Design a protein around this ligand. Structure first.
Ligand SMILES: Cc1ccc(CCc2c3nc[nH]c3cc3c(=O)[nH]c(N)nc23)cc1
Ligand SMILES: Cc1ccc(CCc2c3nc[nH]c3cc3c(=O)[nH]c(N)nc23)cc1
Ligand SMILES: [Zn+2]
Ligand SMILES: [Zn+2]
Lengths: 355, 355
């Protein structure tokens, strides 16, 4: 029987590492990409913010939990909901939590953990504040300090629910904006509380890749080495490669699905916009090396035709290819680290992706 | 090696029959449902009118023909294009053909057959005029007479193209609106020319089921018994069952795909609108007996959730289920005719579908 949670590192190269997370519902190979569930992957993302509202967490629990609801019996990660509340909802912030608007709702550390319990997710995120960017040192500090108080409240709420404490895992989220001293204080606070994994929050908020990598350079080494590192909200293939080079083990990102519904396909030679007329007679698959079922069977010209015609089949094929591309990217990353040639892979990847 | 075209009737019950069409690219079991290709089926529909315009028939031929383009190596049926021109395009009609509007286009019997040749379809429809409904006897007669002149021109154009004459099949289309004498004259004209199959045109144009069935009652027996009978544009499951009872062998219909993108699922207990709140907690599959992969795996509640959330996955699952339902309907029809219990099947089908 697999454990509740066990992270093992099988190989390293520089700051990069590759290994596995064992959980009751399955093994997660790292570095991992975690696609949205409503879009092969070892874990998918649930959408706490949406599910809170439709049908409601209680209702999901009445229907048997998210695994039964979605027909997915493997691990599920849920975010804590405040990021989405603050980006999508009127909002009122206080030390207790956030209220937002049919009727009004409060979201607190305790309520966030309970919602994630009712959904039945396997990896639960602490309830944090994603500090807006840019932020002054004072505002970034005040925000991070609140998030750390909230992290302790999240820990206690999780531990109070036996079914959750015994079968799920809890990740703490580091904040501190772009400031090294605050990132250190946040890492220290999270390690004192103790979590199963550690996320780097507060990035992919408009800072750009150079700045993101700069913050990762000093921030990831502050986290416990023997625990998984999750960079929230990232990203493009080139962001993933550089974040793995800096010690990240887990990724989520809307882009594969967003791109698949909006005409963009990822390839080893960079993204392409399949609606462009240059693809109307292109008999090659979306990508020349991709092993996915779309590229085994259909051409750029046909997918172009479907998308231009407004056919649902087109977006479905684009999305299948994109998620498959991301999983091939992660497999190549894992294999290259395990083989000690990840540094060469990253250089080769970049030379070709940007050519 | 299969023949170019061979229709064999294996069993009959009343006017209903079941059998096979053999063509070079495959066997078609009848009665057959023929789904749109861009949406198991033995033949799919190409969209002549759309393909004429984007990318153009020449361009499709340059890309290797529709089979290669779509990745479908089995039979393809194409319509002749005038129905769609007259419903979707400014139009100018003459004895030569129809002109319509970027720039202008003409469609004639000769051009329609050439377009269908360039597309490479296996079953080619004659270029006809679908008479509007209602029509006076005089207008219905004038229109039908033009269609029969056009049917002869279609026959001659098809026969002039060796690759087409030797590898494809040509169907003539009966017109005559709702008038028995004109339907007879049209059938007589088509049989004198000689076709591989015979379609009943000019229905599913707003006449309603009672009137459609009334016209089928006298029209289908006018066609050669030993050739397939294709009712164009039909229809709902109950239309299909009644048309088979009246001697129809082949069906096309937008409904499965249109419905799948618009929240409607077909079930043995009738259509359901999955967006309705009554399905938000319904743990049953879309249909309790359906063998399709959607109903094996997911609930009404989950598909409702996806559609209400605007997720592409939802429409895809609805469409897969709907096309699968139609193929199960046709399999049950074929089996019940072969077993001599089709009359009982139709009564049982109706009692339940409308309960
Ligand atoms: C469905 C879904 C997908 C992804 C996410 C992650 C959302 C996300 C961020 N996205 C971009 N930058 C982000 C930063 C944070 C952050 O600091 N905290 C949290 N809790 N989430 C973040 C949430 C929900
Ligand atoms: C993609 C596609 C699907 C289906 C069709 C069939 C379109 C269709 C009719 N649809 C409803 N009633 C119809 C009558 C006729 C008719 O009399 N003639 C022709 N040529 N087509 C018909 C054409 C193209
Ligand atoms: Zn692919
Ligand atoms: Zn089904």
């Amino acid at each position: 029987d697999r454990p509740r949670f066990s992270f093992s590192i099988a190989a390293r190269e520089g700051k990069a590492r590759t290994g596995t997370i064992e959980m009751k519902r399955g093994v997660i190979r790292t570095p991992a990409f975690m696609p949205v569930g409503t879009a092969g992957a070892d874990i998918i993302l649930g959408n706490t913010y949406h599910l809170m509202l439709r049908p409601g967490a209680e209702r999901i629990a009445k229907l048997g939990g998210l695994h039964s609801f979605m027909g997915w019996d493997r691990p599920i990660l849920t975010d804590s909901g405040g990021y989405q509340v603050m980006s999508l909802s009127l909002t009122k912030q206080s030390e207790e939590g956030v209220t937002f608007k049919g009727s009004r709702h409060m979201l607190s550390p305790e309520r966030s953990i309970e919602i994630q319990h009712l959904l039945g997710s396997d990896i639960v995120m602490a309830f944090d504040e994603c500090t807006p960017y840019p932020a002054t040192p004072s505002r970034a500090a005040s925000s991070m300090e609140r998030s750390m108080r909230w992290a302790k409240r999240s820990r206690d709420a999780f531990d109070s629910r036996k079914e959750q404490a015994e079968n799920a895992a809890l990740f703490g989220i580091q904040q501190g904006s772009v400031f090294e001293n605050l990132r250190q204080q946040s890492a220290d606070a999270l390690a004192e509380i103790g979590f199963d994994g550690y996320a780097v929050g507060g990035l992919a908020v408009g800072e750009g890749q150079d700045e993101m990598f700069r913050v990762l350079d000093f921030s990831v080494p502050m986290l416990p080495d023997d625990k998984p590192h999750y960079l929230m909200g990232v990203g493009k293939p080139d962001d993933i490669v550089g974040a793995v080079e800096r010690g990240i083990d887990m990724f989520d990102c809307v882009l594969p699905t967003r791109s698949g519904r909006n005409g963009q396909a990822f390839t080893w030679d960079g993204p392409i916009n399949i609606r462009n007329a240059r693809f109307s007679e292109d008999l090659k698959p979306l990508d020349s090396e991709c092993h996915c079922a779309v590229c085994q069977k259909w051409s750029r010209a046909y997918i172009h035709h479907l998308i231009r015609a407004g056919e649902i089949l087109g977006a479905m094929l684009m999305t299948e290819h994109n998620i498959a591309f991301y999983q091939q990217l992660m497999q190549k990353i894992r294999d290259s680290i395990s083989e000690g040639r990840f540094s060469q892979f990253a250089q080769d990847f970049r030379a070709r992706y940007f050519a």
